[PDB]
Design a protein. Structure first.
Ligand SMILES: CCCCCCCCCCCCCCCCCC(=O)OC[C@H](CO[C@@H]1O[C@H](CO[C@H]2O[C@H](CO)[C@H](O)[C@H](O)[C@H]2O)[C@H](O)[C@H](O)[C@H]1O)OC(=O)CCCCCCCCCCCCCCCCC
Ligand code: CLA
Ligand code: CLA
Ligand code: CLA
Ligand SMILES: CC(C)=CCC/C(C)=C/CC/C(C)=C/CC/C(C)=C/CC/C(C)=C/CC/C(C)=C/CC/C(C)=C/CC/C(C)=C/CC/C(C)=C/CC1=CC(=O)C(C)=C(C)C1=O
Ligand SMILES: CC(C)=CCC/C(C)=C/CC/C(C)=C\CC/C(C)=C/CC/C(C)=C/CC/C(C)=C/CC/C(C)=C/CC/C(C)=C/CC/C(C)=C/CC1=CC(=O)C(C)=C(C)C1=O
Ligand SMILES: CCCCCCCCCCCCCCCCCC(=O)OC[C@H](CO[C@@H]1O[C@H](CO)[C@H](O)[C@H](O)[C@H]1O)OC(=O)CCCCCCCCCCCCCCCCC
Ligand SMILES: CCCCCCCCCCCCCCCCCC(=O)OC[C@H](CO[C@@H]1O[C@H](CO)[C@H](O)[C@H](O)[C@H]1O)OC(=O)CCCCCCCCCCCCCCCCC
Ligand SMILES: CCCCCCCCCCCCCCCC(=O)OC[C@H](CO[C@@H]1O[C@H](CS(=O)(=O)O)[C@@H](O)[C@H](O)[C@H]1O)OC(=O)CCCCCCCCCCCCCCC
Ligand SMILES: CCCCCCCCCCCCCCCC(=O)OC[C@H](COP(=O)(O)OC[C@@H](O)CO)OC(=O)CCCCCCCCCCCCCCC
Ligand code: HEC
Ligand code: OEX
Ligand SMILES: [Cl-]
Ligand SMILES: [Cl-]
Ligand code: NA
Lengths: 176, 97, 244, 36, 334, 33, 51, 137, 152, 30, 32
């Protein structure tokens, strides 16, 4: 039912075109990135604090020592990527900040979709497209798709409306 | 002045009867005895100036002439419309199911 | 000797018409009491020239060159039709069937793409009278049909079309509809073109002929959306003759 | 166009050669602890 | 001190502002090629016949695109999986029409990212680190291979690879769902769980650490000046952290070994993204998502719809409309 | 394209106003040193 | 009737003045269509100045 | 709604005799149809010739009529084209062509009636969905 | 019927037909209303009166489907023309206006009748001035909509 | 004008990359 | 009045750019 909700929003609201969703995507994916990259950095800059091959045992919850080298991690990432973190407090605040913010942003976009205040069209494109049958973008291609979704899904998804679409009115491309 | 010629055609007998000059071949399934054999023949030998002209197709068994006779009232003829006969669209007009 | 698929595949030779040896200067005689066909007609363009529009009025623009951007997809071939002898001894080829169209797009200086349906559809071409023999001086001249580049089911990027599609600019729901009429109402053109086939090689032993061709036809008009350009095509041809 | 093809075939061969001979030039020994 | 040996010593120097290395010897030119062709194409490439039907699609800014709708358009279906370098085209005008830049960019880019990954192992070796950060990066790298290479290989055409553009991306993920019901595929579901899960734990770890910083500053100063680069003692108290989260849920659903906690952080999103990379890669071979269409019926044989059929209605409208001019026959088999 | 004309002044100020704010704060931070 | 100087072209005449005259698009400011200017076209002079 | 005998009563021949199937036959038919036929005829369409479906109304206007158990059983023995003008066992699975369509080899005579019976009952249950295609999925 | 009441019965004043980046007054979209053209009555060749199925607020676009009093579809604008049963051309559909600027006027030629059928899904049919504000023809939301959005 | 704007912002971001790597506040120890 | 569109952006930057310069220079004078 949630999957259907996802696809409702594409065809009716064109929700992928919405910058507030895009900033949400960037915050969720930014979070999963930071999660993976931070776990991996710590785990591959560990200090040798025990003899054994399982490096988990050589951590004590009460040691005051940091258990990995922030310094060797900073060098690694400075030389690999060009910048690294240098402040372990900023790093962990940034890990809070990114995914929280992203979610808050998508929320604001949904609030607008409550009112059907969609980010549905680019006017300049529709104006040229209408005047110019040779002008096609991935933007015009995606609205044919949403137009399909609407017409093929609406009668069964909104049964209270008694939508009757006879075959001849359903938007379809050639052969399919 | 700019019209859709396909839409204009739907306002002629083409929109009610099988048009011997224009209709895709799959419409001959709506009547028995017609598809595929006679339908193949009618489409190959179009166009026709009158509905009755179908009976003069060379090679028609006398049984074939009677299946056409029974069905002449479901036929008709209008001017050939280029948009419906170009492309081999009388054999395949891109509609399946 | 003839080659196999695996010999030819990926070379571009599949897009080339058969050649005749430059010794083939014979003549092929025509028994008006016989009928003949063309077992295979092959047309291979080599040049695409487009007519420019020169702004003023009494200058008339020239034909300019273009670049082909659709690769080795240009030749017509496997064409066949009746070859007739008329009262006066003229010969008339009548195209029956074949791969008689190729979509092509060339690009003018300035990067305008010009698409066209290169074709000899419904070619009826005829010689002088009193031929009596096909020679290296025989010239066919004929006209053919140029149907619309897209057929009736074709949908433009807003879902508009002729036998299918929307009848308006649905993205502009309360827009002034008259100014979009030309773009909303699709029209199916059907024009004529001219062709000349100049025979320069004849193999009297085998009824094969080869020569040069020049045709004139209109370009794509995008279902009535813009005005077409005038196109000149030059190339070579091959044809095989046969008794019926 | 053919000239271009030559130039790219040469460029690529040169960088791939660099790569292979680079790693055959004692690469395990290039670390900060144990060299052999 | 031999010529070759000085060179080998610069390539592998850990003193270069950016590390080069042997993997870098391949990565730098391949990524400079991809980058320079991407920027130039996004700004100025003319329209591309992505689907082989002589219906060019405008991707670039000077041709009426904006940052959202622009793309480098995939190469023509007419080419399918054929290799289309520049020197195989009769001219650059042809190569532009048929989508050659996309092939040039994606191939250079794949190579250079493959080498980015090795470069990550290489520097870890030169610095005396453990080696496995590159295994973490293998999940995105795998995901990029999936949508630029594998999925085209399996469908037969680079024209069904992912466009290099924001709206192009959405096109490709819409059509993927009509053709593969990827939402109902379990490996995509783990990907969502991998990516929702990593966003959650990102925020957890960063909120719990931030919650248990040790007072080092005043209220007039950023708490971040409590930490100095390379200080030897931890800057938060992990037992206060364990004691909070263990009481929020219960004691044993909270960590207190920081090594296990960070390995868990690393492993959850990496594994979930491996799977979703596998999903795209196996749907490349049309082993599609679960199909529950008409699975529920009544005593007579009436269909009783479920949400799965509602999804299918949606999928159907996606199917019948994509590449609307492109199919002459009733089954879109690839 | 028939793009909205205040798009430009909107974009230019959206960029310039907060950028200048940060530049002002940074420069006068550094001359405290 | 629409030369460069009616079009507000400032630097195009200075490239024209010393012998650059054609575009990689295939036009030239002397009306010739179908010319191949090589690298030193209007576009290539611009790019080289960026580099 | 349940699978009642009214719905399970199908014409037997063109003279309009009728035959009522058990539930067992109906499900046997549904099994055998999936084994031997659905690969082309899932839903009552024909994947390799969409112009011809198994809607009862199309079967009714087939020459020899096929809207009955006899016509259908015959068609499985000796398929023809829609106008009955030429035999197509070369290219359509049938008992007469089980040499080349091996799944037809082990179909007894009762199997054929269950298949025929399944095809005439199913449009009564599903209506337009049978032969309708994706529009009605 | 007061024109003021007829204007409320028009989807272009529905605050849920807007867009986030479609800026300015509603007038910038459908134009400045000048006149109620009249209430439009569709009939087929049988004399049956037909009804345009109104667009709901969810849909940026909507098919043109004419129904009878009893809900039964009797005409539409077909997308695919080849198997069309219900087209205006085949069904002989006509539009008659009562009230307003077109009171007493009847149109029969199909391209005109489809034209008003298209606007009838918006409800009552109005004459707009699109030149004055260079209106682009795309619905915008009202102050009711913009206030709710900001304050939520 | 919109193309100039999109490309100008992109170019400014590439410029900031350069400064942020080569002209960063250098990390110093204890 | 049919005025120049770019006039607004030319006027605004004409004010904004040189003013900001002076503000940057003044505030960092004060904080030293
Ligand atoms: C950043 C941090 C690290 C530092 C990095 C170091 C800095 C180095 C950065 C350098 C990068 C520079 C940017 C490269 C621009 C690419 C130029 C191009 O694509 O330029 C190509 C140009 C353009 O070609 C023209 O391209 C045109 C394409 O037009 C298109 O474009 C037009 C607009 O321009 C119109 O829109 C037109 O409609 C549209 O179709 C036409 O096809 C013309 O016929 C065609 O001539 O071609 C030519 O003439 C060029 C010459 C090639 C001719 C072939 C001869 C072979 C010579 C090959 C040389 C190989 C290089 C050596 C390698 C190394 C060995 C030491
Ligand atoms: C790369 C792909 C991608 C990514 C990363 C995202 C990411 C996101 N999308 Mg988009 N989406 C995409 C593609 C993507 N989207 C596409 C292609 C479409 C089609 C248009 C959509 C359609 C879409 C819609 C329709 C919506 C999103 C939403 C979201 C957000 C969900 C936030 C969240 O955690 O909700 C998870 C939910 C919560 C965090 C709510 C609270 C959950 C509580 C804490 C759980 C309690 C559990 C409890 C203990 C019980 C457990 C028991 C039970 C599990 C058994 C997030 C920003 C949503 C959004 O923006 O909302 C603001 C939204 O509604 N997306
Ligand atoms: C809430 C809704 C939701 C959510 C959370 C997700 C989440 C996800 N989806 Mg799903 N999806 C949804 C709805 C949703 N989807 C819907 C509704 C549809 C159907 C319409 C889909 C259709 C769909 C498809 C078709 C695909 C996904 C994929 C994905 C994944 C995208 C992230 C990824 O690939 O990481 C992986 C990481 C990367 C791709 C990054 C590669 C990084 C490279 C190596 C480096 C790039 C460098 C760059 C160019 C330069 C930058 C640096 C420079 C600026 C300095 C993720 C698991 C994708 C997937 O599984 O991909 C494998 C995929 O193909 N989804
Ligand atoms: C509660 C506030 C409020 C509300 C509801 C309105 C409502 C309205 N105004 Mg007024 N107005 C307001 C405040 C408000 N105004 C203020 C403060 C000013 C001075 C700036 C004006 C100046 C003004 C003028 C000059 C005009 C209007 C007009 C209008 C109408 C059209 C609005 C429109 O198209 O917006 C479009 C809305 C948007 C484009 C949305 C902008 C928000 C963006 C998307 C977010 C910004 C990015 C942000 C940083 C997100 C990232 C953050 C992240 C890091 C967390 C409408 C009735 C117009 C009218 O019709 O006149 C009669 C008109 O010409 N208003
Ligand atoms: C040529 C033309 C003109 C160009 C066109 C190109 C074009 C298409 C581009 C489009 C660009 C475009 C519009 C972008 C869209 C982006 C968009 C959605 C914006 C997001 C905006 C927004 C504010 C969203 C809210 C959510 C938000 C705050 C997300 C932030 C995302 C973010 C920056 C996450 C971090 C990702 C990242 C790679 C971090 C690396 C972290 C890192 C340095 C780790 C290294 C590291 C780890 C350790 O553990 C330790 C110990 C140390 C020491 C250490 O170092
Ligand atoms: C008619 C009548 C009267 C009817 C009868 C009805 C009746 C009266 C009903 C009333 C019943 C009654 C009153 C209620 C009592 C019943 C009760 C017990 C209810 C159940 C409550 C309930 C449903 C709870 C929901 C369960 C819940 C969601 C728990 C989920 C557990 C779980 C999945 C948690 C995640 C665990 C996990 C591994 C997280 C890791 C996160 C992460 C990596 C953290 C990072 C991190 C972790 C650390 O650890 C530390 C250290 C640090 C540094 C750090 O970074
Ligand atoms: C300090 C301020 C300056 C620095 C900020 C930089 C500028 C920021 C620009 C943001 C506005 C961008 C809109 C551009 C549109 C424009 O150019 O058209 C200009 C439009 C006006 O519309 C104009 O109207 C004209 C006839 O009047 C015609 O219609 C013109 O064509 C039309 O463009 O501007 C607005 O309408 C301004 C209204 C702004 C108020 C919106 C409030 C409601 C939303 C609040 C939601 C808060 C979100 C929280 C986010 C977290
Ligand atoms: C730094 C940031 C920018 C600084 C603030 C902006 C200052 C702009 C001031 C220039 C005003 C430009 C005219 C107003 C805007 C507008 O109308 O421009 C609009 C015009 C552009 O012209 C546009 O052209 C279009 C087609 O290309 C259409 O025809 C439009 O009608 C037309 O507006 O702006 C330019 O032409 C700018 C040219 C600037 C170069 C002038 C060279 C002469 C300079 C020598 C003077 C020496 C001064 C000595 C003083 C001591
Ligand atoms: C029909 C029957 C079927 C049978 C199937 C059986 C299934 C089990 C197979 C899996 C076994 C794998 C071993 C796991 C243990 C291990 O990893 O140790 C590593 C550490 C060590 O623990 C640490 O252990 C340490 C002691 S020692 O190192 O282990 O000796 C100790 O120091 C430390 O405090 C403690 O935390 O464990 C953890 O911290 C928990 C991490 C969980 C690892 C898996 C990640 C899940 C990814 C899936 C996400 C996808 C969603 C998208
Ligand atoms: C060989 C080539 C290798 C690849 C080169 C790629 C270089 C790209 C990296 C960008 C450098 C600029 C970052 C400036 C910012 C910068 O200077 O950061 C520096 C900052 C240093 O953190 P410290 O902990 O040192 O500082 C905190 C203290 O100062 C407290 O005030 O690091 C970050 O916070 C890490 C998070 C940045 C994570 C986001 C950056 C990545 C986003 C990149 C996507 C760009 C958008 C593209 C749009 C088209
Ligand atoms: C593809 C390999 C098929 C299989 C397996 C089955 N059928 Fe079929 N069927 C197929 C085609 C291409 C056609 C059209 C034949 C023609 O050219 O006329 C048919 C036709 C039928 C019909 C007639 C439908 C009508 O409207 O008249 C029937 C009744 C039918 N087929 C039945 C049937 C049965 C019972 C099958 C399983 C034993 C079966 N078919 C398999 C293609 C294929
Ligand atoms: O190309 Mn892109 O997209 Ca995979 O299927 Mn077939 O092909 Mn096209 O349709 Mn659906
Ligand atoms: Cl598509
Ligand atoms: Cl196909
Ligand atoms: Na059943």
């Amino acid at each position: 039912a949630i999957f259907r909700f996802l696809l409702f929003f594409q065809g009716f609201h064109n929700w992928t075109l919405n910058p507030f969703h895009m900033m949400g995507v960037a915050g969720v994916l930014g979070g999963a990135l930071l999660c993976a990259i931070h776990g991996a950095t710590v785990e591959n800059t560990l200090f040798q604090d025990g003899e054994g091959a399982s490096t988990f045992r050589a951590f004590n919850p009460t040691q005051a020592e940091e258990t990995y080298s922030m310094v060797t991690a900073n060098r690694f990432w400075s030389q690999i990527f060009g910048i690294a973190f240098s402040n372990k407090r900023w790093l962990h605040f940034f890990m809070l900040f990114v995914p929280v913010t992203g979610l808050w942003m998508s929320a604001i976009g949904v609030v607008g979709l409550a009112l059907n205040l969609r980010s549905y069209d680019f006017i300049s494109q529709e104006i040229r497209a209408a005047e110019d049958p040779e002008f096609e973008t991935f933007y015009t291609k995606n609205l044919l798709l949403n137009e399909g979704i609407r017409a093929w899904m609406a009668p069964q998804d909104q049964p209270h409306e008694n939508f009757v679409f006879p075959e001849e009115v359903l938007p379809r491309g050639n052969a399919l | 002045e700019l019209v859709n010629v396909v839409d204009e055609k739907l306002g002629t007998a083409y929109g009610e009867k099988i048009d011997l000059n224009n209709t895709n071949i799959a419409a001959f399934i709506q009547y028995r005895g017609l598809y595929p054999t006679l339908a193949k023949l009618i489409v190959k030998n179009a166009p026709y100036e009158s509905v009755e002209d179908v009976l003069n197709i060379p090679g028609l068994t006398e049984r074939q002439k009677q299946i056409l006779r029974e069905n002449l009232e479901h036929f008709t003829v209008t001017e050939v419309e280029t948009a419906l006969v170009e492309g081999g669209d009388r054999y395949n007009n891109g509609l399946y199911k | 000797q003839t080659l196999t698929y695996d010999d030819i595949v990926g070379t571009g030779l599949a897009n080339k018409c058969p050649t005749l040896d430059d010794t083939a200067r014979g003549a092929y005689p025509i028994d008006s009491s016989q009928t003949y066909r063309i077992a295979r007609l092959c047309l291979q363009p080599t040049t695409f020239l487009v007519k420019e529009e020169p702004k003023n009025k009494r200058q008339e623009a020239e034909f300019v060159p273009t670049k082909l951007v659709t690769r080795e997809t240009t030749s017509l071939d496997q064409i066949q039709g009746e070859l007739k002898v008329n009262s006066d001894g003229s010969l008339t080829f009548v195209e029956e069937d074949g791969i008689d169209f190729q979509p092509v797009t060339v690009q003018m200086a300035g990067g305008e793409r010009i698409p066209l349906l290169f074709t000899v559809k419904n070619l009826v071409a005829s010689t002088q009278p009193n031929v009596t023999s096909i020679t290296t001086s025989t010239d066919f001249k004929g006209e053919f049909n140029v149907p619309s580049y897209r057929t009736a089911n074709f949908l433009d990027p807003k879902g508009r079309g002729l036998a299918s599609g929307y009848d308006s600019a649905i993205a502009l729901p309360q827009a002034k509809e008259e100014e979009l009429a030309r773009a909303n109402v699709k029209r199916f053109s059907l024009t004529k073109g001219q062709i000349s086939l100049n025979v320069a090689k004849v193999d009297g032993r085998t009824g094969e002929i080869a020569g040069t061709f020049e045709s004139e036809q209109l370009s794509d008009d995008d279902m009535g959306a813009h005005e077409p350009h005038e196109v000149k095509i030059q190339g070579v041809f091959y044809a095989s003759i046969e008794p019926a | 166009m053919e000239t271009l093809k030559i130039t790219v075939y040469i460029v690529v061969t040169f960088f791939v050669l660099l790569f292979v001979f680079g790693f055959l030039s004692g690469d395990p020994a290039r670390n900060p602890k144990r060299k052999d | 001190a031999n010529l070759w040996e000085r060179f080998c010593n610069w390539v592998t120097s850990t003193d270069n502002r950016l590390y080069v290395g042997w993997f870098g010897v391949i990565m730098i030119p391949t990524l400079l090629a991809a980058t320079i062709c991407f920027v130039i194409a996004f700004i100025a490439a003319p329209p591309v016949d992505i689907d082989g039907i002589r219906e060019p699609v405008s991707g670039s800014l000077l041709y009426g695109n904006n940052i959202i709708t622009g793309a480098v358009v995939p190469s023509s279906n007419a080419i399918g999986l054929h290799f289309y370098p520049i020197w195989e085209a009769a001219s650059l005008d042809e190569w532009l029409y048929n989508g050659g830049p996309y092939q040039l960019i994606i191939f250079h880019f794949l190579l250079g990212a493959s080498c980015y990954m090795g470069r990550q192992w290489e520097l870890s070796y030169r610095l005396g680190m453990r080696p496995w950060i590159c295994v973490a990066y293998s999940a995105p790298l795998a995901s990029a291979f999936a949508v630029f290479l594998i999925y085209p290989i399996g469908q037969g055409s680079f024209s069904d690879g992912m466009p290099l553009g924001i709206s192009g991306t959405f096109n490709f993920m819409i059509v993927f769902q009509a053709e593969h019901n990827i939402l109902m595929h379990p490996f995509h579901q783990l990907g969502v769980a991998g990516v929702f899960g990593g966003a959650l734990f990102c925020a957890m770890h960063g909120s719990l650490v931030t919650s248990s910083l040790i007072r080092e500053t005043t209220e007039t100063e950023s708490a971040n000046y409590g930490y100095k680069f390379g200080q030897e003692e931890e800057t938060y108290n992990i037992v206060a952290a364990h004691g909070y989260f263990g009481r929020l849920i219960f004691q044993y659903a909270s960590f207190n070994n920081s090594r296990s906690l960070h390995f868990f952080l690393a492993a959850w999103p990496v594994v979930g993204v491996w799977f979703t990379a596998l999903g795209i890669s196996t749907m490349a071979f049309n082993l599609n998502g679960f199909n529950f269409n008409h699975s529920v019926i009544d005593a007579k044989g009436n269909v009783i719809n479920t949400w799965a059929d509602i999804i299918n209605r949606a999928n159907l409208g996606m199917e019948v409309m994509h590449e609307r001019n492109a199919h002459n026959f009733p089954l879109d088999l690839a | 394209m028939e793009v909205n004309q205040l798009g430009l002044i909107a974009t230019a100020l959206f960029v310039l106003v907060p950028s200048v704010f940060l530049i002002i704060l940074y420069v006068q931070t550094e001359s405290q040193q | 009737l629409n030369p460069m100087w009616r079009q507000g072209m400032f630097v195009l005449p200075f490239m024209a003045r010393l012998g650059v005259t054609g575009s990689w698009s295939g036009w030239s400011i002397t009306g010739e269509t179908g010319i191949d200017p090589g690298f030193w076209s209007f576009e290539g002079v611009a790019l080289a100045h960026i580099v | 709604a349940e699978l009642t005998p009214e719905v399970l009563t199908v014409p037997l021949n063109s003279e309009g005799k009728t035959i009522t199937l058990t539930e067992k036959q109906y499900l046997e038919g549904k099994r055998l149809f999936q084994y031997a036929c659905a690969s082309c005829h899932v839903g009552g369409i024909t994947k390799t010739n969409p112009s011809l479906d198994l809607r009862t109304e199309t079967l009714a206007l087939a020459t020899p009529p096929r809207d009955n158990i006899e016509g259908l059983v015959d068609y499985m023995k000796n398929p023809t084209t829609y106008d009955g003008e030429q035999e197509i066992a070369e290219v359509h699975p049938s008992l007469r062509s089980a040499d080349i369509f091996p799944k037809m080899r082990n179909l007894t005579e009762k199997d054929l009636v269950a298949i025929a019976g399944h095809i005439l009952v199913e449009p009564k249950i599903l209506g337009d969905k049978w032969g309708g295609g994706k529009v009605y999925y | 019927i007061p024109e003021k009441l007829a204007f409320y019965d028009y989807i272009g004043n529905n605050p849920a037909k807007g867009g986030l980046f479609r800026t300015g007054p509603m007038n910038k979209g459908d134009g400045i209303a000048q006149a109620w053209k009249g209430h439009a009555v569709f009939r087929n060749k049988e004399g049956e009166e037909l009804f345009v199925r109104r667009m709901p607020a969810f849909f940026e676009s909507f098919p043109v489907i004419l129904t009878d009093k009893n809900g039964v579809v009797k005409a539409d604008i077909p997308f695919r023309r080849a198997e069309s049963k219900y087209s205006f051309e085949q069904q002989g559909v006509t539009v008659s206006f009562y009230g307003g600027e077109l009171n007493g006027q009847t149109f029969t030629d199909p391209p005109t009748v489809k034209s008003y059928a298209r606007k009838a899904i918006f409800g009552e049919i109005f004459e707009f001035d699109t030149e004055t504000l260079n209106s682009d023809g795309i619905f915008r939301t009202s102050p009711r909509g913009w206030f709710t959005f900001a304050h939520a | 004008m919109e193309t100039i704007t999109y490309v100008f912002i992109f170019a400014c971001i590439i410029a900031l990359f350069f400064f942020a790597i080569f002209f960063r506040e250098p990390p110093r120890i204890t």
